[PDB]
């Protein structure tokens, strides 16, 4: 079979059921509320199209997901939200994990260069924070 | 909540970063993929991050990882308040304690002089109470906290060679052939147990019952409350040197090269484990596996249900004095001056503690946990080792008289402290207990 | 083997 879902943009997508049911949100609306098509206000055609891609293709992070998520920040940010909104445990985990790996590895000074972030700590406050979270 | 409170009251505002813009929950789902070491660096990024990383349920689980189970509640006031997570501080506390054992400056230990010119034959460390036993015929209850002697259990007419303790109840075994039950607080003998004819060499307490092994070749099970002798286990032809009791089975090791498994209630020997070609000196039992160390140099691992030998662990070259079994990981101290770590499931010898900083003589005692192995020796040192790598870390104690008589007879360790029974046969070291503290200021 | 035990 095959159901249709409408992105927030107004673009209709035709996806094989089951590939679509990897989203309990879409699943709930299909099986329980009987939505035809399925309106997805929080997901636009661009991300929805990306989510559908990851789903048709279906702890540690595979080599495909690693490449597929080799995207830019914001897109990753969008995938985390679409995954949360759509309720796709797999996608959510893989994307969130990918963000964590950007932090692993240390220095607070380096963590900023990666996420921008500004040191809004006052002279004293920074000292206090450095002491409290002292390692070794 | 709590994380929201912080945001409203502190008002960080305006962050151009990926996680500060994510809904609180998803930022947390992300930070949860990090390890404590990361979360601590992340928390030094900015106030927004610090507030996030300081969750609580995030740390409650990171603690359930290092097996913490109990959060730490500190007390007291700076301005811009911060709602510290008890679980997080509990984690850091432990981290600091581990580091303290590992490389923290060695604070001179409390010295507890006692048992002059005699040997401390048995040691017990429970909570804030230390109990030393001696062939000087007495036992002394001490405060690990103040280092003061609280009481001296005088009563035996022979030397004390064994003991057991379970908060306020102390038990002793003497050459005078009797066990005695004491009140650790008042220091009064509550019972005197007769029945053994020869030296009460070993004993193991489980709840309200205690089992004793003697040179008379028998064991007896006693009720600590009613000072009575419930059962007598007869079947060993030679002296009983070691014993274990889990409340269900009694396991014994004797100088007849035999290990016997018993059902006390019916005074029957269910199994006689045969294999050791010499005296059995040490035993450990976890309700499933019996483990015995012999003067024959080997260590056997047996199935308590079938009586079958599962592994014959070889490698030591002399008498295995003590062994400790936890979670199927076994650590054996040997007169060959070596210490070994084994996986009693596979039989693999995970590590041998030796190297340039190994013991120069027989290992007399040992303690271990998930991170370290603590070993004592006639060489007058107590060493700290890395359990996961088998590497030497440092000498926690180094008796100056070590090479000329100074000896460390036995040790007991808690999470924050180490108690060492020390002395000598020649007077170069006065007998005493050394108490080292590794607690942290929090 | 001079790890403690009592004589006879």
Rg (C-alpha) for chain A, rounded Å, is 19
Question: CA–CA distance from B322 to each of B56, B130, B136, B424 (Å)?
Answer: 41, 20, 23, 20
Contact B41 A107 (CB under 8 A): yes
Burial bucket for residue B400 (CB in 10 Å: 0-12, 13-18, 19+): exposed
Dig out the tokens for B250 from the structure.
């009694």
Contacts of B409 in chain C (CB under 8 A): 4
Thinking of the domain B1-67+84-103, which architecture would CATH place it in? Up-down Bundle (1.20)
Contact B135 C6 (CB under 8 A): yes
| Closest residue to A73, CB basis, from B18, B41, B43 | B18
Residue pointed to by tokens 């709840």: B207
Whether the Cβ atoms of residue B411 and residue B421 lie closer than 8 Å to each other:
yes
Alpha-carbon dihedral B85, B90, B94, B96, rounded to 10 degrees = 50
Contact B16 A119 (CB under 8 A): no
Residues B437 and A52: their CA atoms lie apart, in Å, by 60
Whether the Cβ atoms of residue A37 and residue A5 lie closer than 8 Å to each other:
yes
CA of A25, closest CA in chain B: separation in Å? Answer: 17
Domain annotation for chain A: domains and CATH numbers: 1-136 (3.30.710.10)
Question: CA–CA distance from A7 to each of A22, A32, A65, A82, B315 (Å)?
Answer: 17, 20, 23, 11, 69
Dig out the tokens for A19 from the structure.
């590939």
HSE-up (13 A, CA, CB side) for residue B421? 26
Residues B352 and B350: their CA atoms lie apart, in Å, by 7
Dig out the tokens for B171 from the structure.
């038990």
The 3-state DSSP class for residue A36 equals coil
Residue pointed to by tokens 């709590």: B2
Phi, psi values for residue A95, rounded to 5°: -75, -45
CA B216 to chain CA mean position, Å:
29
Whether the Cβ atoms of residue A75 and residue A95 lie closer than 8 Å to each other:
no
Dig out the tokens for B25 from the structure.
């929950």
- From B355, B358, B367, B350, select the one nearest B395 (Cα to Cα): B358
Rg (C-alpha) for chain C, rounded Å, is 6
CA of B1, closest CA in chain A: separation in Å? Answer: 21
Report the phi/psi class of residue B272: left, alpha or beta, with left for phi > 0 and alpha for psi in -120 to 50: beta
Residue pointed to by tokens 């004819």: B197
Contacts of B135 in chain C (CB under 8 A): 6
User: Starting from the edge strand earliest in sequence, which strands make up the sheet with B179-183, in order?
Assistant: B160-166, B169-174, B179-183, B188-193
Phi, psi values for residue B257, rounded to 5°: 65, 10
The 3-state DSSP class for residue A38 equals strand
* Strand bridging mode A38-40 / A3-7: parallel
Residue pointed to by tokens 């405060």: B143
CA of B21, closest CA in chain A: separation in Å? Answer: 9
**Technique used to solve these coordinates:** X-ray
* Domain assignments of chain B as residue spans, ordered by start: 1-67+84-103, 104-442
Dig out the tokens for B229 from the structure.
């002798």
Cβ partners under 8 Å of residue B271, min gap 6: B260, B261, B304, B307
Residues B330 and B340: their CA atoms lie apart, in Å, by 8
Question: CA–CA distance from B428 to each of B389, B416, B425 (Å)?
Answer: 35, 29, 8
Contacts of B42 in chain A (CB under 8 A): 103, 108, 111
Cβ partners under 8 Å of residue B338, min gap 6: B316, B317, B352, B353, B354, B358, B359, B363
Dig out the tokens for B352 from the structure.
């041998």
The 3-state DSSP class for residue A80 equals helix
Report the phi/psi class of residue B13: left, alpha or beta, with left for phi > 0 and alpha for psi in -120 to 50: left
SS3 for chain B, per residue?
Answer: CCHHHHHHHHCCCCCCCCCCCCCHHHHHHHHCCCCHHHHHHHCCCCHHHHHHHCCCHHHHHHHCCCCCCCCCCCCCCCCCCCCCCHHHHHHHHHHHHHHHHHHCCCCCCEEEECCCCCCEEEEEEECCEEEEEECCCCEEEEECCCCCEEEEECCCCCCEEEEEEECCEEEEEECCCCEEEEECCCCEEEEEECCCCCCEEEEEEECCEEEEEECCCEEEEEECCCCCEEEEEECCCCCEEEEEECCCCEEEEECCCCEEEEEHHHCEEEEEECCCCCCEEEEEECCCEEEEEECCCCEEEEECCCCCEEEEECCCCCCEEEEEEECCEEEEEECCCCEEEEECCCCCEEEEECCCCCCCCCEEEEEECCCEEEEEECCCEEEEEECCCCCEEEEEEECCCHHHCCEEEEEEECCCEEEEEEECCCCCCCCEEEEEECCCCC
Whether B262 has its CB under 8 Å from any CB of chain C: the answer is no
- One-character DSSP codes across A87-124: T-HHHHHHHHHHHHTTTTT--HHHHHHHH-------HH
**Which H or E run includes A81?**
helix A75-86
Alpha-carbon dihedral B55, B56, B62, B68, rounded to 10 degrees = 160
Thinking of the domain B104-442, which architecture would CATH place it in? 7 Propeller (2.130)
Handedness of CA B50, B54, B58, B62 (dihedral sign): positive
Residue pointed to by tokens 């969130």: A96
């Amino acid at each position: 079979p095959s159901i249709k879902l409408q992105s927030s943009d107004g673009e209709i997508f035709e996806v094989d059921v089951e590939i679509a049911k990897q989203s309990v949100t879409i699943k709930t609306m299909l099986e329980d509320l009987g939505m035809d098509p399925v309106p997805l206000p929080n997901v636009n055609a661009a991300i929805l199209k990306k989510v559908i891609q990851w789903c048709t293709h279906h702890d540690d992070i595979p080599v495909w997901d690693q490449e597929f998520l080799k995207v830019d920040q914001g897109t990753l940010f969008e995938l985390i939200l679409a995954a949360n909104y759509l309720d796709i445990k797999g996608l959510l985990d893989v994307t969130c994990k990918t963000v964590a790996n950007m932090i692993k590895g240390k220095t607070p000074e380096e963590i900023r260069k990666t996420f921008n972030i500004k040191n809004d700590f006052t002279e004293e406050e920074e000292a206090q924070v450095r002491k409290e979270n002292q390692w070794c | 909540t709590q994380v929201k409170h912080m945001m409203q009251v502190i008002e960080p505002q305006f962050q151009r970063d990926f996680i500060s813009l994510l809904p609180k929950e998803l930022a947390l789902y992300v930070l949860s993929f990090l390890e404590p070491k990361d979360l601590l660096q992340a928390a030094q990024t900015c106030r927004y991050w610090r507030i996030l990383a300081e969750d609580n349920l995030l740390w409650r689980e990171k603690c359930k990882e290092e097996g913490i189970d109990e959060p730490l509640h500190i007390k007291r006031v700076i301005k811009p308040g911060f709602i510290h997570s008890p679980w997080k501080s509990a984690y850091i506390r432990q981290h600091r304690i581990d580091t303290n054992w590992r490389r923290g400056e060695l604070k001179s230990p409390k010295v507890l002089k006692g048992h002059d010119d005699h040997v401390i034959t048995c040691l017990q460390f429970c909570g804030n109470r230390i109990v030393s036993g001696s062939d000087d015929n007495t036992l002394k209850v001490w405060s690990a906290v103040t280092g003061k002697c609280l009481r001296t259990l005088v009563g035996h007419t022979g030397g004390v060679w064994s003991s057991q303790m379970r908060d306020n109840i102390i038990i002793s075994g003497s050459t005078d052939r009797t066990l005695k039950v004491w009140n650790a607080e008042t220091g009064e003998c509550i019972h005197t147990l007769y029945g053994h004819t020869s030296t009460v060499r070993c004993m193991h307490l489980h709840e309200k019952r205690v089992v004793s092994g003697s040179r008379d070749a028998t064991l007896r099970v006693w009720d600590i409350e009613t000072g009575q002798c419930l059962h007598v286990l007869m079947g060993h032809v030679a002296a009983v040197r070691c014993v274990q009791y889990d409340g269900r089975r009694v396991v014994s090791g004797a100088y007849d090269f035999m290990v016997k498994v018993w059902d006390p209630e019916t005074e029957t020997c269910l199994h006689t484990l045969q294999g050791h070609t010499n005296r059995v000196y040490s035993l450990q039992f976890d309700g499933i596996h019996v483990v015995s160390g012999s003067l024959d140099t080997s260590i056997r691992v047996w199935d308590v249900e079938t009586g079958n030998c599962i592994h014959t662990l070889t490698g030591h070259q002399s008498l295995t004095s003590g062994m400790e079994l936890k979670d199927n990981i076994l650590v054996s101290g040997n007169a060959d001056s070596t210490v070994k770590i084994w996986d009693i499931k596979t039989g693999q010898c995970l590590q041998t503690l030796q190297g340039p900083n190994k013991h120069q003589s027989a290992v007399t005692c040992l303690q271990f946990n998930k991170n370290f192995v603590i070993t004592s020796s006639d060489d007058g040192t107590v060493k700290l080792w890395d359990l996961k790598t088998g590497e030497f870390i440092r000498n926690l104690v180094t008796l100056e008289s070590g090479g000329s008589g100074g000896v460390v007879w036995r040790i007991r360790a808690s999470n924050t402290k180490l108690v060492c029974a020390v002395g000598s046969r020649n007077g170069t070291e006065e007998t005493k207990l050394l108490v080292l503290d590794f607690d942290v200021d929090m | 083997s001079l790890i403690p035990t009592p004589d006879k």
